[PDB]
Coordinates of N, CA and C in Angstrom, one line a residue:
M1 N 10.8 -23.1 6.8 CA 12.3 -22.3 6.9 C 12.5 -21.4 7.8
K2 N 13.7 -21.1 8.9 CA 13.7 -20.3 10.3 C 14.6 -19.2 9.9
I3 N 14.2 -18.2 10.3 CA 14.5 -16.3 10.4 C 15.5 -17.1 11.2
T4 N 16.5 -15.7 11.2 CA 17.3 -15.5 12.5 C 17.6 -14.1 12.7
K5 N 18.2 -13.4 13.8 CA 18.0 -11.8 13.8 C 19.8 -11.7 13.9
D6 N 20.7 -13.0 12.6 CA 21.8 -12.0 12.3 C 21.3 -12.3 11.0
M7 N 20.3 -12.6 10.4 CA 19.8 -12.4 9.0 C 20.0 -10.8 8.7
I8 N 20.2 -10.5 7.1 CA 19.6 -9.7 6.5 C 18.5 -9.2 6.4
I9 N 18.5 -7.5 7.0 CA 16.7 -7.1 6.1 C 16.1 -7.0 5.1
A10 N 17.0 -6.6 4.2 CA 17.3 -6.9 2.7 C 17.4 -8.0 2.1
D11 N 17.8 -8.8 3.1 CA 18.0 -10.6 2.0 C 16.4 -10.8 2.5
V12 N 15.8 -10.9 3.8 CA 14.3 -11.5 4.0 C 13.2 -10.9 2.8
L13 N 13.5 -9.5 3.0 CA 12.7 -8.7 1.8 C 13.2 -9.6 0.1
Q14 N 13.9 -10.6 0.2 CA 14.6 -10.9 -0.6 C 13.5 -12.8 -0.8
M15 N 13.4 -12.9 0.3 CA 12.7 -14.0 0.4 C 11.4 -14.3 0.3
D16 N 10.7 -12.6 0.6 CA 9.4 -12.2 0.3 C 9.6 -11.1 0.7
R17 N 8.4 -10.4 0.0 CA 8.2 -8.6 -0.2 C 7.0 -8.1 1.3
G18 N 6.6 -9.0 1.2 CA 5.7 -8.9 2.2 C 6.4 -9.3 4.0
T19 N 7.5 -9.3 4.3 CA 7.8 -9.0 5.9 C 7.6 -7.8 5.4
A20 N 8.0 -6.6 4.9 CA 8.5 -5.6 4.9 C 7.3 -5.4 5.6
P21 N 6.0 -5.3 6.0 CA 4.7 -4.8 7.0 C 5.5 -4.9 8.4
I22 N 6.2 -6.2 8.2 CA 6.3 -7.3 9.8 C 7.7 -6.2 10.6
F23 N 8.5 -5.6 9.3 CA 9.5 -4.6 10.1 C 9.1 -3.8 10.0
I24 N 8.2 -3.4 9.9 CA 7.4 -1.8 10.1 C 6.7 -1.9 11.0
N25 N 6.4 -2.9 12.0 CA 5.1 -3.4 12.7 C 6.3 -3.3 14.0
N26 N 7.4 -3.8 14.2 CA 8.2 -3.8 15.4 C 9.2 -2.4 15.4
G27 N 8.9 -1.4 14.2 CA 9.2 0.0 14.4 C 10.4 0.7 13.5
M28 N 10.3 -0.6 12.4 CA 11.6 -0.6 11.5 C 11.4 1.1 10.6
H29 N 12.6 1.7 9.8 CA 12.1 3.0 9.5 C 13.1 2.6 7.8
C30 N 12.0 2.1 7.1 CA 12.5 1.9 5.8 C 13.0 3.0 4.6
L31 N 14.1 2.9 5.3 CA 15.4 3.9 4.3 C 16.4 3.8 3.7
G32 N 16.8 4.0 2.7 CA 18.2 4.0 1.8 C 19.4 4.3 2.8
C33 N 19.8 3.6 3.8 CA 20.6 3.4 4.7 C 21.2 2.1 5.0
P34 N 22.1 1.5 5.6 CA 22.7 0.6 6.3 C 21.8 -0.1 7.2
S35 N 21.9 1.0 8.3 CA 21.5 1.2 9.8 C 19.9 0.2 9.7
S36 N 18.5 -0.1 8.9 CA 17.6 -0.3 8.1 C 17.8 -0.9 7.2
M37 N 17.9 -1.3 6.1 CA 17.7 -2.4 4.9 C 19.5 -2.9 4.9
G38 N 20.7 -2.2 5.0 CA 22.0 -2.8 4.6 C 22.2 -4.1 5.6
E39 N 22.2 -3.7 7.0 CA 22.6 -4.4 7.8 C 21.6 -5.7 8.4
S40 N 21.8 -6.2 9.4 CA 21.3 -7.5 9.9 C 20.2 -7.4 11.2
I41 N 19.2 -8.1 11.0 CA 18.2 -7.8 11.9 C 18.7 -7.0 13.1
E42 N 19.4 -7.7 13.9 CA 19.4 -7.2 15.1 C 20.4 -6.4 15.7
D43 N 21.4 -5.8 14.2 CA 22.1 -4.8 14.0 C 20.9 -3.5 13.5
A44 N 20.3 -3.9 13.2 CA 19.2 -2.5 13.0 C 18.2 -2.1 14.5
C45 N 18.0 -3.0 14.6 CA 17.3 -3.3 15.7 C 17.3 -2.3 16.8
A46 N 18.6 -2.6 17.2 CA 20.1 -2.3 18.5 C 20.0 -1.0 18.7
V47 N 19.9 -0.3 17.3 CA 20.0 0.8 17.0 C 18.9 1.8 17.6
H48 N 17.8 1.5 17.0 CA 16.4 2.0 17.2 C 16.2 1.3 18.4
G49 N 16.8 0.7 19.0 CA 15.6 0.0 20.7 C 15.3 -0.9 20.3
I50 N 15.3 -1.8 19.1 CA 13.9 -2.5 18.8 C 13.7 -4.0 19.4
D51 N 12.7 -4.2 19.7 CA 12.7 -5.9 19.7 C 12.9 -7.0 18.9
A52 N 13.7 -7.3 18.0 CA 14.3 -8.2 17.7 C 13.8 -9.6 17.9
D53 N 13.9 -9.9 19.0 CA 13.4 -11.2 19.2 C 12.3 -11.3 19.2
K54 N 10.9 -10.5 19.3 CA 10.0 -10.3 18.8 C 9.7 -10.6 17.4
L55 N 10.3 -9.1 17.2 CA 10.2 -9.2 14.8 C 11.1 -10.9 14.2
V56 N 12.7 -11.2 14.8 CA 12.3 -12.0 14.0 C 10.8 -13.6 14.5
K57 N 10.8 -13.5 15.3 CA 9.3 -14.7 15.6 C 8.6 -14.1 14.7
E58 N 7.7 -13.1 14.4 CA 6.8 -12.8 13.5 C 7.9 -13.4 12.2
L59 N 8.7 -12.6 11.8 CA 9.4 -13.4 10.4 C 9.5 -14.7 10.6
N60 N 9.8 -15.5 11.4 CA 9.0 -17.0 11.3 C 7.9 -17.5 10.9
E61 N 7.3 -17.0 11.9 CA 5.8 -17.0 12.0 C 4.8 -17.5 10.6
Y62 N 5.7 -15.9 10.2 CA 4.7 -15.4 8.6 C 5.3 -16.2 7.7
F63 N 6.3 -16.8 7.4 CA 6.8 -17.9 6.6 C 5.9 -19.2 7.0
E64 N 6.3 -19.6 7.8 CA 5.8 -21.1 8.1 C 4.1 -20.8 8.3
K65 N 3.6 -20.3 8.2 CA 2.4 -19.9 8.0 C 2.3 -20.4 6.1
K66 N 3.2 -19.4 5.6 CA 3.3 -19.6 4.2 C 3.2 -21.3 3.3
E67 N 4.4 -21.6 4.6 CA 4.1 -23.6 4.2 C 3.4 -24.4 4.6
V68 N 2.2 -23.7 5.6 CA 1.2 -24.1 5.2 C 0.0 -23.9 4.1
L69 N -0.1 -22.7 3.5 CA -1.2 -22.3 3.2 C -0.7 -22.6 1.8
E70 N 0.5 -22.0 0.7 CA 1.1 -22.6 0.0 C 0.8 -24.1 -0.4

């Protein structure tokens, strides 16, 4: 599986709930708002000036680890 920054944060959470600590790792604020859950990774990142490039990489690596473990 290959995650992109255009993907929705809430939608990535649908692929795996364990992705939340990764968003939190990069400085995301989990709150009932579009600019955190509803919008795309890049969109929410731009708001808080978060490094979506690193965040997305960690999201990918995470899933691609599971594709080996499972």
